[PDB]
Amino acid sequence: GDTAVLVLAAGPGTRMRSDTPKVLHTLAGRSMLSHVLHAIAKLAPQRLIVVLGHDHQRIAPLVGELADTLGRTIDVALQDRPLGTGHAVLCGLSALPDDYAGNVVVTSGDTPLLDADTLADLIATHRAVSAAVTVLTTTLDDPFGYGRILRTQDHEVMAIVEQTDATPSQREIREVNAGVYAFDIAALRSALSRLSSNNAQQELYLTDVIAILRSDGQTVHASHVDDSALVAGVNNRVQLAELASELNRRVVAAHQLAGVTVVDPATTWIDVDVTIGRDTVIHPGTQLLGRTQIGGRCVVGPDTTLTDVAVGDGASVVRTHGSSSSIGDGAAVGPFTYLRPGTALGADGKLGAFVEVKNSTIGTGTKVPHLTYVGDADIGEYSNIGASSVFVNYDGTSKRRTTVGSHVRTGSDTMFVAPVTIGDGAYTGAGTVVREDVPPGALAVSAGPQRNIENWVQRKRPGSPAAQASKRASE
Amino acid sequence: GDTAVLVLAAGPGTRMRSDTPKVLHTLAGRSMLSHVLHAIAKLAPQRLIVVLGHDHQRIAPLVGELADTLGRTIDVALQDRPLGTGHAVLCGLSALPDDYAGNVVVTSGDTPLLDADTLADLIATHRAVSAAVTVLTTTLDDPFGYGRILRTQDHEVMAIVEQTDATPSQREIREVNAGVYAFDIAALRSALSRLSSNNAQQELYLTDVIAILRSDGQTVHASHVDDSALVAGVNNRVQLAELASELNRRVVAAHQLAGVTVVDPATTWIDVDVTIGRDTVIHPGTQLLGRTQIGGRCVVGPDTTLTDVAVGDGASVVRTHGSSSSIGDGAAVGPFTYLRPGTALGADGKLGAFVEVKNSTIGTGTKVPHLTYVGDADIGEYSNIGASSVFVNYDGTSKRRTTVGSHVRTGSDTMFVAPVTIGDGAYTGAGTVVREDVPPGALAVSAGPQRNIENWVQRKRPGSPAAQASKRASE
Amino acid sequence: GDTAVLVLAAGPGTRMRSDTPKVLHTLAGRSMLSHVLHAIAKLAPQRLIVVLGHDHQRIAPLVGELADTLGRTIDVALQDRPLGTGHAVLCGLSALPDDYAGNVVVTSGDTPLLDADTLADLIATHRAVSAAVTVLTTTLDDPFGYGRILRTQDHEVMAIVEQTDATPSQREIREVNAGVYAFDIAALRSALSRLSSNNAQQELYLTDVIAILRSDGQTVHASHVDDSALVAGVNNRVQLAELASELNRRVVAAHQLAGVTVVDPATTWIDVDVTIGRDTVIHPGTQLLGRTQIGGRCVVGPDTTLTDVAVGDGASVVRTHGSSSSIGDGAAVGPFTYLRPGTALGADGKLGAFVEVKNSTIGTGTKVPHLTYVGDADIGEYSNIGASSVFVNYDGTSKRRTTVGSHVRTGSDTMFVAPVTIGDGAYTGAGTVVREDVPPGALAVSAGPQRNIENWVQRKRPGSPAAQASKRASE
Ligand SMILES: CC(=O)SCCNC(=O)CCNC(=O)[C@H](O)C(C)(C)COP(=O)(O)OP(=O)(O)OC[C@H]1O[C@@H](n2cnc3c(N)ncnc32)[C@H](O)[C@@H]1OP(=O)(O)O
Ligand SMILES: CC(=O)SCCNC(=O)CCNC(=O)[C@H](O)C(C)(C)COP(=O)(O)OP(=O)(O)OC[C@H]1O[C@@H](n2cnc3c(N)ncnc32)[C@H](O)[C@@H]1OP(=O)(O)O
Ligand SMILES: CC(=O)SCCNC(=O)CCNC(=O)[C@H](O)C(C)(C)COP(=O)(O)OP(=O)(O)OC[C@H]1O[C@@H](n2cnc3c(N)ncnc32)[C@H](O)[C@@H]1OP(=O)(O)O
Ligand SMILES: O=P(O)(O)O[C@H]1O[C@H](CO)[C@@H](O)[C@H](O)[C@H]1O
Ligand SMILES: O=P(O)(O)O[C@H]1O[C@H](CO)[C@@H](O)[C@H](O)[C@H]1O
Ligand SMILES: O=P(O)(O)O[C@H]1O[C@H](CO)[C@@H](O)[C@H](O)[C@H]1O
Ligand SMILES: [Mg+2]
């Protein structure tokens, strides 16, 4: 129907002890504010307002970025002074027309696990019972901090008492206020006009509209959500880590039911935007971050961190730290491999142990197996780079590119002093410093000939164990 | 006594969403079918039949392999059409003589944590009470999917109702059918001849023989196992990961009571065939896979993956990815070390940081400390390989071997272009390309002499910060 | 007040199956005995005695070391024969004056999570109720092994029955004896003089003084601690790992409330002496060990192990194994970096992928990015070490030092054969073996010139795919 959702992100969040605003702390690839705005946008409300207190100039541009990603307008109201949650709703009420007749949903920006289904059931129950206010509730083993729900024996809601304003008998109430409301626009404005600051924290409690609307004879309703994590709030980093662990278990479980093997979900972190193909095995200690895409029948080996990495089908990424890179079908990466942004490994390519690639395009079937740095280079198809090689892309002042052809066989400890081009099918010997272009089919060497200095050990290392091993060898 | 166990592995397992059959999905080093057949074989039943539906030609050879490992015959019956668990038992009943007089135990191939003790207590209780059928039961917080146990107030078993055929009041029953049965051969055949397909799934429910045998006046018994994990079944990958985590905790706990320190059992995976010595410390992020053998007083450092690796006593394997290798007593491996198949590190040997070994035998006390690839090589005792060295074992067409003597001291950045032999006590200078044999006690060099081009920086890098550091140095 | 605490560390701890004494097994950076003695010393008792049985000569020096660290005297009594906990207290009673009039607290050396607050509430309750003996109790789901608390319906304590001396009805008691006592010095000595060895284990049960003092009309009190982990004991390595995991969760949670982001507390181990600055992010798979100090706004990346490493502010330590090193402000370390003792990385320095440093001082802004070993070296400010370089610090017999100036630009695959000095602003070409000093502003090369052997591939690799790629290139 015609609804308007308001997100209250004006709280200071002092218990986070962070120079970064609370609602912008991230989990599973999105900030808490981004998590809330994503779920609200999936219901497509007619209006959406975000109330910001201080840190408003630091958070407001990120609200506009989310408005661009979700493809709609997201208004922003600003609370001048921290006068409580009631005053914050009144600030967000100025961003609507004074003649607004739709429902008004109130939420906070620190409930990251809140989904569109819980909000849909909130407005659905709100309409089905024809209530003036519907509040979301849940039951916790520790109801500390939250506002307590006061109900009579017939389970009808009487009021909500805050933690700072609760008697010891009321502290024992384990049904808590989730902070997600659904109002009638007219009945709400009437309540907040009658709010009193005569409380412990000396603020305008939005929670007091429950009792105010009860004294008016209006229908007061509370919808109890059993899944407490969906409505849990974040005030400290301990709760942020708890909700991040819970959200990660649900993300991993969804991939498993889709056909993805996650050996150790406890030590496997997967962001919300990550896609994994069918019959892919993910080993412990792995984090899938950002917009990482894993194809089908892959093996993302243990202790692998991937951020915005696109991997094709049937590839193996074992013990790899990569970001902003592409890995083709059937490619083998790892173990102990470092992928910097700009890495495009072709299909059936190999980047082996102790190899670092940065801003390089390596064609189909080319292998870089051992102890090599590949920076700002272009390598063809079905080539082979010897071990202990380096693509020298820094002359001390600027960066230069290197071009390597197809079907080449470069020797071990080959230094490519860019800019240098290596033709197709070319060879370089072991220990070659390539400073000039190598034509196709040529062999490039530079190392001097081998010189053997006989019995040098017995003359310069006389009392050494090696001198005795050589003296005993002459027998 | 005289028993016959039948494993029903004919289910499709559609909720796994895998091109691999369900019962062949692995955990703790064995497939689910291998886990079940291992426990059954420890009781030594007279007959053992495995019922297979589709995927039968893909699973049947693996049943014969398990028959070879467990040293006995394992028969295989095949269900032509998926007509339910009752028809599957009838298919497996054709693999016995028609005059079989022993007990008949029925199990499934997706209960990997089932052990021989639970099966022994099943047949023992079955004999002690003289029942015609004994079924294993357990109590779960979520009894969904499982068949519900219907008992009267005197706890006598009446029937088993499937999830698809259960009233809402019967769904609330939390005592579930574990799927492990123990029958009388004659009383069983009589039941399955009277099965009806008039149910929701239109199949022959083996569970219906509980009520059929009750209507015959036969003794019906249910044995309740408190340890629900021992009889839990796998249908999706989420349950496969849950049981794998539970089985791993029990494997780790057994090692700890035997004298093995596991710092973080949550992030330590140990397969069932792994043996670890007394007073060995295992650090977080470690996986012990396959037939890996760890000696006593070892330190398997953090983030170490070992598959079929044999490590002696008093060795340290820190941050190492190894497979099909041997590590001698007192050897030091890691951190960041890659061990390929064929690696035989002698006692008190060292393979240090960023070292990869493949199909190489390195003698006692030899050290390969830094940034070295050792492939297809043989190194003697008490040698020392300089850093940044490479054993060149690939000339572009074939692979060649390298031989290194004892007590040698090879310099840094030494390229061993195989085939090359290095005598005992030999030396090679830094930056040497060894293309010919080095006699014992000789020194092999190849690098050109050092040439200093004075004030080259001020001429070719004029406006650089290095030119100002050199201009200021002349003071 | 005037108190005397006695720690009973005389037990054999046979279920640990360790050649190391039980109380010296470590967790969170301290042994169990060190954990107990640290909490006791925070209350500053007048006397402190540690009772040791066998392993006494192996544990006693570590008690004196703790006496030095905590800045007070810690006496040591020795139990000649394992005659039970009652005889052990009598042995520790000989280390006091026979005229001691203060309270006497008895504890064990295998309760590592015991803090000074629990001990303070023990003596406070002991004084407030004027009891002759106060014992700490808790409730467990599995009370096995522990001594059971026998209370009447008015909750008054009657006696403590050991596990070996308990009837089946007494085994069901879930309130257990924590083993932490508080005695009156006179009432205690009177009890232990009346102890009888007529029990199952044939020992002097210190627990029997509860019933003895009850038969004397003395006030017997039991203080129930709800937090069972604070008083839990260790007898096997399974319980040692459980308490280590619990203690780590509390250490991590304290850092989070202080302003430290711990993404995965389950896979993040932090020792008790570690300090972490505000707004530092710690990624999964990380262990902070020893006296490691992390500054503010840092990023300790995933899979990082740090022991006694001091990191400044705004630095990044990703995928790094380091120990006994210092990392300056704004420095970037990792991924895949090995820091050996003696490493002093200046501010804004860089130690990149596959780099190992050992006993080296690298100045401000100097970068060592790829595949380099730096051992026993001194590098100036704003220098740059090329990839695949090695600081040769071992001539086969002894170790030599290397000196590198400021603003230098050393080329890739440069071998520094120590002892060698490199002046400020100097350059070295790729593939240079530096055996002599390089003056400031000079360029040091040694590699021979490049030689191209045309169509060598078609002559020496005739039937190879590279020969066809070169034959097709001539078009
Ligand atoms: C572990 C891995 O990843 S391996 C992957 C990379 N593979 C390699 O490193 C392969 C390295 N192999 C080599 O360098 C070998 O020396 C090869 C393949 C060049 C051998 O080539 P050959 O067939 O022996 O060449 P041949 O002897 O016919 O002549 C080549 C010429 O170049 C010179 N030369 C050959 N190899 C080298 C070298 N490594 N360094 C310097 N000069 C060399 C020779 O002196 C000879 O010159 P001359 O005979 O005119 O004086
Ligand atoms: C970090 C680590 O892992 S270290 C482990 C491995 N250790 C090493 O790398 C040690 C490397 N050390 C070297 O190469 C040294 O140069 C040493 C040990 C050879 C020095 O040897 P010296 O006693 O100086 O030899 P000396 O000067 O008597 O004569 C040796 C001859 O070989 C030549 N030579 C010596 N070293 C080298 C070298 N590194 N490259 C090329 N040629 C060399 C010299 O020119 C000299 O020839 P000439 O005098 O006839 O012209
Ligand atoms: C991936 C990374 O980490 S990069 C980090 C480290 N960066 C590097 O490795 C840079 C390496 N760059 C080089 O070695 C280049 O060859 C440079 C910078 C020396 C080029 O210098 P140039 O301006 O070409 O020198 P120029 O040609 O004027 O003369 C230099 C002399 O030294 C010789 N020389 C130059 N480079 C080298 C080398 N790499 N090996 C051996 N000799 C060399 C030349 O033969 C020339 O001698 P000549 O002309 O008298 O016969
Ligand atoms: O497989 P190995 O022996 O480790 O590796 C060797 O052969 C490979 C091809 O087979 C080459 O790409 C490697 O350069 C070489 O070191
Ligand atoms: O111990 P360091 O200095 O890291 O290592 C150095 O000495 C070792 C012997 O002591 C040698 O094996 C290494 O090649 C050398 O780099
Ligand atoms: O940043 P890159 O290209 O990986 O690294 C390159 O430039 C750096 C400076 O920008 C240098 O320190 C490195 O030696 C060089 O390899
Ligand atoms: Mg090298």
Which three-class secondary structure string do you get for chain B?
CCEEEEEEECCCCHHHCCCCCHHHCEECCEEHHHHHHHHHHCCCCCEEEEEEECEHHHHHHHHHHHHHHCCCCCEEEECCCCCCHHHHHHHHHCCCCCCCCCEEEEEECCCCCCCHHHHHHHHHHHHHCCCCEEEEEEECCCCCCCCEEEECCCCCEEEEECHHHCCHHHHCCCEEEEEEEEEEHHHHHHHHCCCCCCCCCCCCCHHHHHHHHHHCCCCEEEEECCCHHHHCCCCCHHHHHHHHHHHHHHHHHHHHHHCCEECCHHHEEECCCCEECCCCEECCCEEEECCCEECCCCEECCCCEEEEEEECCCCEECCEEEEEEEECCCCEECCCEEECCCEEECCCCEEEECEEEECCEECCCCEEEECCEEECEEECCCCEECCCCEEECECCCCECCEEECCCCEECCCCEEECCEEECCCCEECCCCEECCCECCCCEEECCCCCEEECCHHHHHCCCCHHHHHHHCCCC
CATH of the domain at A275: 2.160.10.10
CA distance A256 to A79: 44
Contact C384, C409 (CB under 8 A): yes
Q: Which one, of C187, C202, C82, lies nearest residue C131 by Cα? A: C187
Structural domain harbouring C365? 260-448
Contact A131, A216 (CB under 8 A): no
Output the residue whose Cα is nearest ligand 1's atom 36: A429
In chain A, residues with a C-beta closer than 8 Å to the C-beta of B425 are 457, 465-471, 473
CA distance A452 to A189: 96
Q: Which one, of A95, A88, A156, A127, lies nearest residue A2 by Cα? A: A127
CA atoms within 13 A on the CB side of B320: 34
Cα B106 to Cα B37, B50, B53, B227, C414, distances in angstroms: 12, 10, 16, 19, 70
Q: Which residue has the tokens 């999964």?
A: C284
Tokens of residue B180, six digits: 């492990």
Burial category of A439 from C-beta neighbours within 10 Å (exposed 0-12, middle 13-18, buried 19 and up)? buried
Tokens of residue C292, six digits: 């490691």
Rounded to an integer, what is the distance from CA C67 to the centroid of its chain? 19
Task: Tell me, yes or no, whether B464 lies in a domain.
Answer: no
CA atoms within 13 A on the CB side of A371: 36
Q: How many CB atoms lie within 10 A of CB B329?
A: 18
CA distance C338 to B387: 14
Contact C371 A392 (CB under 8 A): no
Residues B127 and B254 in one domain: yes
CA distance C356 to C345: 12
CA distance A108 to B176: 42
Tokens of residue B48, six digits: 């053992």
Rounded to an integer, what is the distance from CA A317 to the centroid of its chain? 20
Ligand 6 in contact with A393 (CB < 6 A)? yes
Data resolution in angstroms:
2.3
The sign one gets for the Cα dihedral A463, A466, A468, A474 is negative
CA distance B34 to A9: 55
CA distance C182 to C159: 15
Q: Which residue has the tokens 């042994």?
A: C31
E-assigned strand segments in A90-229: 103-108, 133-139, 148-151, 157-161, 175-184, 220-224
State how many domains chain C has: 2
Contact A466 B442 (CB under 8 A): no
Tokens of residue B298, six digits: 């070892």
Tokens of residue A5, six digits: 């959702």
Q: Which residue has the tokens 């972190």?
A: A269
Tokens of residue C63, six digits: 């008690």
Give one word for B179, left, alpha or beta, with left for phi > 0 and alpha for psi -120 to 50. left
Q: Which chains touch B (3 or more CB pairs under 8 A)?
A: A, C
Tell which of B226, B242, B259 closes a domain. Answer: B259
CA atoms within 13 A on the CB side of B104: 25
Residues B301 and B239 in one domain: no
CA distance B126 to B132: 8
Instruction: Find all residues with CB under 8 Å of B32, minimum gap 6, and list them.
Output: B22, B23, B24, B25, B26, B109, B110, B111, B112, B234, B240
Contact A49, A96 (CB under 8 A): yes
Can you list the pairs that C247-255 forms with residues at least 24 positions away whose Cβ atoms lie under 8 Å?
Answer: C247/C27, C247/C28, C247/C112, C247/C113, C248/C28, C251/C28, C253/A238
Q: How many CB atoms lie within 10 A of CB B7?
A: 26
Ligand 6 in contact with A418 (CB < 6 A)? no
- Pairing state between β A305-311 and A320-327: parallel
Distance B394 CA to ligand 4 centre (A): 6
CA distance A366 to A348: 8
CA distance C366 to C349: 5
Residues C268 and C190 in one domain: no
Rounded to an integer, what is the distance from CA C260 to the centroid of its chain? 19
Q: How many CB atoms lie within 10 A of CB B450?
A: 18
Distance C394 CA to ligand 5 centre (A): 6
Task: Tell me, yes or no, whether B11 lies in a domain.
Answer: yes
Phi, psi of A91 (to 5 degrees): -65, -45
Residues C148 and C204 in one domain: yes
Least distant ligand from the CA of B453 = 3
Tokens of residue C164, six digits: 């070996």
Q: How many CB atoms lie within 10 A of CB A138?
A: 22
Q: Which one, of A39, A35, A4, lies nearest residue A115 by Cα? A: A39
The sign one gets for the Cα dihedral A16, A20, A24, A29 is negative
Peptide bond into C335 cis (omega under 30): yes
Can you list the pairs that B288-294 forms with residues at least 24 positions away whose Cβ atoms lie under 8 Å?
Answer: B289/B29, B290/B29, B290/B323
Instruction: Find all residues with CB under 8 Å of C232, minimum gap 6, and list them.
Output: C111, C113, C239, C242, C243
∠B405-B408-B410 over CA atoms, to 5°?
115
Ligand 3 in contact with A471 (CB < 6 A)? no
**Cα torsion for B369, B371, B374, B375, to the nearest 10°?**
160
The sign one gets for the Cα dihedral A244, A248, A249, A254 is positive
Q: Which one, of B10, B2, B56, B63, lies nearest residue B37 by Cα? A: B63
Instruction: Find all residues with CB under 8 Å of C32, minimum gap 6, and list them.
Output: C22, C23, C24, C25, C26, C109, C110, C111, C112, C234, C240
Q: What is the DSSP letter of A146?
A: S
- Specify which residues A90 forms β-bridges with: none
Q: Which one, of C79, C53, C75, lies nearest residue C63 by Cα? A: C75
> Which SS3 state, helix, strand or coil, does residue C2 take?
coil
Task: Tell me, yes or no, whether A453 lies in a domain.
Answer: no
Contact C147, C160 (CB under 8 A): yes
Distance C454 CA to ligand 1 centre (A): 14
Which site among A15, A356, A358 would you substitute to test the C interface, given the most C Cβ atoms closer than 10 Å to its Cβ?
A356
CATH of the domain at C159: 3.90.550.10
Q: What residue type is assigned to position C96 of the chain?
A: L
- Give A456 to chain B, closest Cα distance, Å: 5
Residue positions of A in the annotated binding site for UDP-N-acetyl-alpha-D-glucosamine?
A: 8-11, 22, 79, 84-85, 108-110, 147, 162, 177, 235, 340, 358, 373, 384
Instruction: Find all residues with CB under 8 Å of A172, minimum gap 6, and list them.
Output: none
CA distance C366 to B388: 21
Ligand 5 in contact with C394 (CB < 6 A)? yes
- Rounded to a whole number of angstroms, the CA Rg of chain C reads 32
Task: Tell me, yes or no, whether B67 lies in a domain.
Answer: yes
> Which SS3 state, helix, strand or coil, does residue A76 take?
strand
Residues C193 and C276 in one domain: no
Q: Which residues of A are catalytic?
A: 370
Contact B370, C388 (CB under 8 A): no
Which site among B470, B471, B472, B474 would you substitute to test the C interface, given the most C Cβ atoms closer than 10 Å to its Cβ?
B470
Cα B350 to Cα B166, B244, B369, B423, distances in angstroms: 65, 35, 6, 21
Instruction: Find all residues with CB under 8 Å of A254, minimum gap 6, and list them.
Output: none
CA distance A304 to A291: 15
Residues A44 and A178 in one domain: yes
Ligand 4 binding pocket (C-beta < 6 A) is: A 367, 369, 384, 386-387; B 358, 375, 393-394
Residues B150 and B287 in one domain: no
> Which SS3 state, helix, strand or coil, does residue C406 take?
coil
Cα B313 to Cα A385, B263, B327, B328, B331, distances in angstroms: 38, 19, 9, 7, 9
Among C390, C432, C461, whose Cβ lies nearest the Cβ of B388? C390
Contact A446, C450 (CB under 8 A): yes
- Give C325 to chain B, closest Cα distance, Å: 16
- Give A445 to chain C, closest Cα distance, Å: 5
Peptide bond into B82 cis (omega under 30): no
Contact C451 A466 (CB under 8 A): no
- Specify which residues A333 forms β-bridges with: A317, A351
- Pairing state between β B427-428 and C157-161: unpaired
Distance C303 CA to ligand 7 centre (A): 27
Residues A97 and A179 in one domain: yes
> Which SS3 state, helix, strand or coil, does residue A217 take?
coil
Q: How many CB atoms lie within 10 A of CB C201?
A: 12
Instruction: Find all residues with CB under 8 Å of C93, minimum gap 6, and list them.
Output: C6, C104, C188, C189, C192
∠A85-A37-A108 over CA atoms, to 5°?
20
CA distance B18 to B386: 48
CA distance B16 to B240: 9
Q: What is the DSSP letter of C169?
A: H
Ligand 5 in contact with C395 (CB < 6 A)? no
Task: Tell me, yes or no, whether A460 lies in a domain.
Answer: no
CA distance C472 to C475: 6
Distance C411 CA to ligand 3 centre (A): 8
Q: What residue type is assigned to position B321 of the chain?
A: H
Q: Which residue has the tokens 């440069």?
A: C414
Q: Which residue has the tokens 């959500």?
A: A225
Task: Tell me, yes or no, whether A6 lies in a domain.
Answer: yes
CA distance B377 to B379: 7
Among B17, B338, B417, whose Cβ lies nearest the Cβ of A353? B338
Residues C144 and C279 in one domain: no
The sign one gets for the Cα dihedral A122, A127, A130, A133 is positive
Residues B53 and B142 in one domain: yes
Q: Which of C54, C321, C370, C407 is catalytic?
A: C370
Ligand 6 in contact with A394 (CB < 6 A)? yes
Contact C406, C390 (CB under 8 A): no
Contact C373 B386 (CB under 8 A): no
B471 is in an annotated binding site: no
B84 is in an annotated binding site: yes
Tokens of residue C33, six digits: 């005995």
Contact A406 C469 (CB under 8 A): yes
Q: What residue type is assigned to position C338 of the chain?
A: Y
Output the residue whose Cα is nearest ligand 6's atom 13: C369
Give the nearest ligand 2 atom to B413 CA: 9
Residues C366 and C224 in one domain: no
Which site among B433, B437, B446, B470 would you substitute to test the A interface, given the most A Cβ atoms closer than 10 Å to its Cβ?
B433
Task: Tell me, yes or no, whether B465 lies in a domain.
Answer: no
Ligand 1 in contact with A352 (CB < 6 A)? no
Output the residue whose Cα is nearest ligand 3's atom 33: C445
Element (H, E) at C345: strand C343-345
Give one word for B413, left, alpha or beta, with left for phi > 0 and alpha for psi -120 to 50. left
Phi, psi of C18 (to 5 degrees): -135, 140
Residues B28 and B124 in one domain: yes
Q: Which residue has the tokens 């082979």?
A: A384
Ligand 3 in contact with A447 (CB < 6 A)? no
Instruction: Find all residues with CB under 8 Å of A84, minimum gap 6, and list them.
Output: A197, A201, A203, A204, A205, A206
Q: What residue type is assigned to position B280 of the chain?
A: T
In chain B, residues with a C-beta closer than 8 Å to the C-beta of C445 are 450-451, 453
CA distance C369 to C353: 6
CA distance A67 to C282: 31
In chain B, residues with a C-beta closer than 8 Å to the C-beta of A282 are none
Distance C379 CA to ligand 6 centre (A): 18
Burial category of A68 from C-beta neighbours within 10 Å (exposed 0-12, middle 13-18, buried 19 and up)? exposed
- Specify which residues C367 forms β-bridges with: C350, C384
Task: Tell me, yes or no, whether C458 lies in a domain.
Answer: no
Helix axis angle for C237-258 and A237-258, nearest 10°, is 120
- Give B252 to chain C, closest Cα distance, Å: 9
Q: Which chains touch C (3 or more CB pairs under 8 A)?
A: A, B
Ligand 2 in contact with B429 (CB < 6 A)? yes
Cα B287 to Cα A298, B226, B290, B324, C172, distances in angstroms: 20, 30, 10, 14, 39
Burial category of B11 from C-beta neighbours within 10 Å (exposed 0-12, middle 13-18, buried 19 and up)? buried
Q: Which residue has the tokens 């990495």?
A: A309
- Pairing state between β A443-445 and A427-428: parallel
